[PDB]
C-alpha cells in the first residue's frame, strides 16, 4: 500500500529551539500506521545547493507521529530550508520547509477553503481556482510579507492540496492543516494562528478568507479593516470585515493603489 507521509511546515523565531514534526501513514485514508520505526531527518542547509545534510534519527510512536528537535549546535539562522524525512525501512519520505524568522516578522494569512476556490462552499478534489487569487497572494509576497496558508482539511489530504497550490502557481508559503482527529477546523485554525503570534512572535497584519474565517481572525485580535472576506451577505459582512463584493481582480487593483485600508 502506498505511503502517505506528511511533515509540518515549521516556523520558528531565531534563537528558539527548532523542532520538526511529521506523520507516517500508509494508504489513502490512513488505514495503516507506521509505528516504532526509524526515520532519518535531512535538511538542505544551503537551500539552493540541492545538497542534503543528515541531522539525526527519530522513532515513530503508536499513532505514527514523530517529533525531532534540531540539536542547538546545528540550529539554522534566518531563512527558509527544505526538509526531508526518510523512513529507513522502505526509503519512503515526507517533505516540508523549516522557516526561521526574526522576531516580529510581518505576515499575511490566507484561509484557503472557499477563498482560493471559485465556490465559497463546494470543493471536491480539484476545484476551479477563483479569479485573481494568485495575483493577490503574489502582491503580498512581493510587498515583503511572509505568506501563511491555513486550511480546514485534514493533513491526510496534504499531498493533493499542495499539488493543487503548485498546479495553479501559488507563491511558496507556510502551509498548515487540521490534524484529522478532532474535527473543529475553525478551532484548529485559530489555535494554530495564535501559536504563531504568541510563540513564534509573528506580526500577522492581515487575514483573507470566507465568511466562516471572520471568527478565526477576530480571535486573533485582527481588526475588521485588516480582514478581507469574499461571500454574498453584504450588510452582515460589511459590519465585521472588509467585504470583497467585486472579487479579487478589482481588489488587486486597490492593493496596487495602496488604497485597501
From Swiss-Prot:
UniProt PTM: Phosphorylated on multiple sites by CDK1 at the onset of mitosis. Phosphorylation facilitates dissociation from the Golgi complex and is required for interaction with PLK1.
Subcellular localization: Cytoplasm; Golgi apparatus, Golgi stack membrane; Endoplasmic reticulum membrane; Lipid droplet
Tissue specificity annotation: Detected at high levels in brain, and at lower levels in lung, kidney, spleen and liver (at protein level). Ubiquitous. Highly expressed in embryonic retina and the central nervous system.
Domain of life per record: Eukaryota
Subunit relationships: Interacts with PTK2B via its C-terminus. Interacts with RHOA. Has higher affinity for the inactive, GDP-bound form of RHOA. The CDK1-phosphorylated form interacts with PLK1. Interacts with VAPB and PIK4CA.
Family to which this protein belongs: Belongs to the PtdIns transfer protein family. PI transfer class IIA subfamily.
Annotated protein name in UniProt: Membrane-associated phosphatidylinositol transfer protein 1
Organism: Mus musculus
Source species taxonomy: Eukaryota, Metazoa, Chordata, Craniata, Vertebrata
Gene: Pitpnm1
Residue window of the full protein shown: 915 to 1175 of 1243
Amino acid at each position: 500500500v502506498t505511503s502517505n507521509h506528511r511533515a509540518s511546515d515549521t516556523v520558528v523565531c531565531e534563537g528558539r529551539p527548532q523542532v520538526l514534526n511529521g506523520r507516517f501513514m500508509y494508504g489513502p485514508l490512513d488505514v495503516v500506521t507506521l509505528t516504532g520505526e526509524k526515520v532519518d531527518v535531512y535538511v538542505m542547509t544551503q537551500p539552493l545547493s540541492g545538497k542534503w545534510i543528515h541531522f539525526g534519527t527519530e522513532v515513530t510512536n503508536s499513532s505514527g507521529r514523530l517529533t525531532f528537535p534540531v540539536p542547538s549546535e546545528r540550529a539554522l539562522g534566518i531563512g527558509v530550508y527544505p526538509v526531508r524525512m526518510v523512513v529507513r525501512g522502505d526509503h519512503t519520505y515526507a517533505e516540508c520547509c523549516l522557516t526561521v524568522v526574526s522576531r516580529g516578522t510581518e505576515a499575511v494569512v490566507f484561509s484557503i477553503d472557499g477563498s482560493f476556490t471559485a465556490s465559497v462552499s463546494i470543493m471536491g478534489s480539484d476545484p476551479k481556482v477563483r479569479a485573481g487569487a494568485v495575483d493577490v497572494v503574489r502582491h503580498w509576497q512581493d510587498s515583503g510579507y511572509l505568506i501563511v496558508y491555513v486550511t480546514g482539511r485534514p493533513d491526510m489530504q496534504k499531498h493533493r492540496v499542495v499539488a493543487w497550490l503548485s498546479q495553479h502557481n501559488f507563491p511558496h508559503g507556510v502551509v498548515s492543516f487540521c490534524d484529522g482527529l478532532t474535527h473543529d477546523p475553525l478551532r484548529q485554525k485559530a489555535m494554530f494562528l495564535q501559536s504563531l503570534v504568541q510563540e513564534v512572535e509573528l506580526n500577522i497584519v492581515a487575514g483573507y478568507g470566507s465568511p466562516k474565517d471572520v471568527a478565526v481572525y477576530a480571535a486573533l485580535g485582527l481588526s475588521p479593516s485588516q480582514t478581507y472576506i469574499v461571500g454574498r451577505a453584504v450588510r452582515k459582512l460589511q459590519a465585521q470585515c472588509q467585504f470583497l463584493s467585486d472579487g479579487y481582480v478589482a481588489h488587486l487593483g486597490q492593493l496596487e493603489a495602496g488604497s485597501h485600508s
